[PDB]
Amino acid sequence: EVKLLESGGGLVQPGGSLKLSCAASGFDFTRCWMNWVRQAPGKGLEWIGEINPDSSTIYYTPSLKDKFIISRDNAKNTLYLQMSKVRSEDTALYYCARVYYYYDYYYAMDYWGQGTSVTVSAAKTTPPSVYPLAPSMVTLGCLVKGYFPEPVTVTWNSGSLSSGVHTFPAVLQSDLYTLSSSVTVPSSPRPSETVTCNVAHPASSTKVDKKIAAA
Amino acid sequence: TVVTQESALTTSPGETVTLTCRSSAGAVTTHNFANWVQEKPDHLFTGLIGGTNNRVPGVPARFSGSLIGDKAALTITGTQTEDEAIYFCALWYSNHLVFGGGTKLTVLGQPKSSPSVTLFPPSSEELETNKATLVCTITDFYPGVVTVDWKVDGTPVTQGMETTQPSKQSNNKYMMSSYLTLTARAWERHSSYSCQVTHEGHTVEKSLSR
Ligand SMILES: CN1CCC[C@H]1c1cccnc1
Numbered sequence: 001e002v003k004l005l006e007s008g009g010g011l012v013q014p015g016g017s018l019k020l021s022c023a024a025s026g027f028d029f030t031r032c033w034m035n036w037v038r039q040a041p042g043k044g045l046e047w048i049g050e051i052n053p054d055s056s057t058i059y060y061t062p063s064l065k066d067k068f069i070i071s072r073d074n075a076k077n078t079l080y081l082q083m084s085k086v087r088s089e090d091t092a093l094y095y096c097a098r099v100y101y102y103y104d105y106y107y108a109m110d111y112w113g114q115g116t117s118v119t120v121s122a123a124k125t126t127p128p129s130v131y132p133l134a135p136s137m138v139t140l141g142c143l144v145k146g147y148f149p150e151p152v153t154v155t156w157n158s159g160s161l162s163s164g165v166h167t168f169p170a171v172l173q174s175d176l177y178t179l180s181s182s183v184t185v186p187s188s189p190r191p192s193e194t195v196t197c198n199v200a201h202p203a204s205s206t207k208v209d210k211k212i213a214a215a
Numbered sequence: 216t217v218v219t220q221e222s223a224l225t226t227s228p229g230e231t232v233t234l235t236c237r238s239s240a241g242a243v244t245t246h247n248f249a250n251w252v253q254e255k256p257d258h259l260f261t262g263l264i265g266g267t268n269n270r271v272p273g274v275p276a277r278f279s280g281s282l283i284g285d286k287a288a289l290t291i292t293g294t295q296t297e298d299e300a301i302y303f304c305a306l307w308y309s310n311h312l313v314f315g316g317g318t319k320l321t322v323l324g325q326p327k328s329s330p331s332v333t334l335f336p337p338s339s340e341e342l343e344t345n346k347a348t349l350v351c352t353i354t355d356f357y358p359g360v361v362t363v364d365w366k367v368d369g370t371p372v373t374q375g376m377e378t379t380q381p382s383k384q385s386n387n388k389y390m391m392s393s394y395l396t397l398t399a400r401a402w403e404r405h406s407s408y409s410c411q412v413t414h415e416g417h418t419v420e421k422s423l424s425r
Binding site for chain 2: 049062
């Protein structure tokens, strides 16, 4: 059970600073190089750097050396990443990985952290406007528009309609996120029995219930 | 500086597929210590190869690394359906590691399914806020490569739209959403709205008129 539990991420104001932690468990942290890699919303993987077991060697992607400081505390089996003067371009999921020296023959980035998200934005906590989406079987849905920050949770009829439900990934637009959730139901129960979507936005401490009715 | 991989490759299970990894800085040599990382849905990354041709213990034997000409290679033989995934290569240059852009590998492990498309108009509640969002839900298509075009009175829309990247449904098919956000002025200035979903050469249209 190699565990790489990361923490310290979240919302940070542009120009601000953050320090990410990667707590290693289940292996000898002191015989292993460790790295940091980030994956932005739509782009692929970008290497940040890596650190010696004894921090005698520290490597960085050249263009990032001045914005990031990698470090480790073998006493706490933990790896650190300091971010400074962050811009919106620095929004991404940040991963720590173990770069294990297999058999003293080759390195391999085997075990990866789940990832911690870093969102660089000046935007404020904005609750979602929930809108009903309606015109054989019938396709209904809910538009969960303009919330910040992520996440929001969606269910149908309080988590009873689980068949036919498709909740899609969020999109970003004007600093605000949006997503949708659809449910395909037999044309008999709609209209008929009632379909209502249940949106939850913890950050704003908001929950909304909206019923789908024909235009 | 720039490591390049095929953007996408398609194979069928049991076949052999080879992903390559080229470098702007010259030929790829064993001194670049090519690494291969797999990404599966839910941002799950696992190291496949290190040192160009060494398989990380626990990785199925059908994965192997090598060099081919001036490039590093990832070869999958007897490709399984579970190998549909994204594969990143990473090359070492003395003091930093550079990841390729990634290869989205499609392993045809399901019969081709055409996308089910639904176009919702803006809700009356949203119009009261003077904005109009059309929502195009795209579901139950395989393979998970679709392109989405929006037409307003017949003009290809090029801004004001956000399209979700295909997401793996429970049936192992793929789904996606597309939005067209208009001002209420724009919504009332035009009358014909259509969401076009192109999947494996054929195009599906859903449309509506104000
Ligand atoms: C482990 N680091 C020092 C020598 C090679 C380098 C490295 C980084 C990532 C993958 N393989 C090797």
